[PDB]
A paper describes a structure:
TatD is a conserved protein widely expressed in different species, including bacteria, fungi, plants and animals. Here we provide lines of evidence showing that TatD is a 3′–5′ exonuclease that processes single-stranded DNA in DNA repair. TatD represents the first example of a TIM-barrel exonuclease that hydrolyzes the phosphodiester bond at the 3′ end of a nucleic acid chain. TatD has a TIM-barrel fold and it trims DNA from 3′-to-5′ ends in the hydrogen peroxide-induced DNA repair, including double-strand break repair and nucleotide excision repair in E. coli.
To characterize the biochemical properties and examine the structural basis of TatD in DNA degradation, the full-length E. coli TatD with a C-terminal His-tag was expressed and purified by chromatographic methods using a Ni-NTA affinity column followed by a Q-Sepharose anion exchange column. The gel filtration profile showed that TatD formed a stable monomer with a molecular weight of ∼30 kDa at pH 7.2. TatD has a TIM-barrel fold, forming a barrel made of eight β-strands surrounding by nine α-helices. The electrostatic surface potential of TatD revealed an acidic pocket on the top loop region of the β barrel with a patch of basic surface next to the pocket. This acidic pocket is likely the metal-ion binding site and the basic surface on the side with several basic residues, including R98, R129 and R219, is likely involved in DNA binding. Since the E. coli TatD does not bear these two histidine residues, very likely it belongs to the Group I TatD that are activated by Mg2+ but not by Zn2+. Therefore, based on the structure comparison of the active site of TatD, E. coli TatD resembles more closely to the group I TatD and likely binds two or three Mg2+ ions in the active site for DNA hydrolysis. In summary, we suggest that the conserved acidic residues E91, E201 and D203 are responsible for binding of metal ions, and H62 for playing a critical catalytic role in the active site of E. coli TatD in DNA hydrolysis.
Residue numbers in the entry: 1 to 262
The structure:
Amino acid sequence: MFDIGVNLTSSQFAKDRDDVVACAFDAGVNGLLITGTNLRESQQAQKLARQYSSCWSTAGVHPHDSSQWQAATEEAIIELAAQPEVVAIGECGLDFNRNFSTPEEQERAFVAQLRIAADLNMPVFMHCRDAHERFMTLLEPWLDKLPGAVLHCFTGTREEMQACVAHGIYIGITGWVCDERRGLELRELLPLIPAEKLLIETDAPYLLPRDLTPKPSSRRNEPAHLPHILQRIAHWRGEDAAWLAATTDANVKTLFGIAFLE
């Protein structure tokens, strides 16, 4: 198995990062992709990915941080992207929340990063929150000249999922599926996701699985909880966990062009 969504740069891991990674590995997670959400965090992520075996990172600017996009940002992204730890441009995309960055600022930063990924022939690590129509409209002239893309932390409808996978987009499922109140629609479309488009993630330290037992007092999520998520997803899909683990691992290698041990 493989966690495509780990905010390992988070302050929540500052004291025990070596152990968090090692615990993830001891629990059978074969590799991590560390999220970059702005320029400095992307820089930290790449530094951390050097520190551990089977760790990679993304380089980019989250739509929340899109207001900081500048003329020098592109070159900085490319400088990072040139490094072998960096395997995707992102996290980038749209969130209909405009309080931290305007839709104008979001669209501009998003298109800019799609352009970089096309120039570098790299896949994109994407994010879409209540913005499917605008999102696909901007993606359209770029996605086909990209090696691939993932919609990480997918929270859309069944039709929206089907619209995305038609264009090759991988669907990233977190522990939110395990939320009884809030993850129902997600859980119900789950078996309809094509196996070869399915990717798995914790989004640690966030989205601690509600059906996880036992839970920490800190309520901090960690990649070591990935096997729980995979097992729940496999069950709801009516599949063997070992099989889906192999499938999703292949999806990661197909998408990011990386190699890691099974």
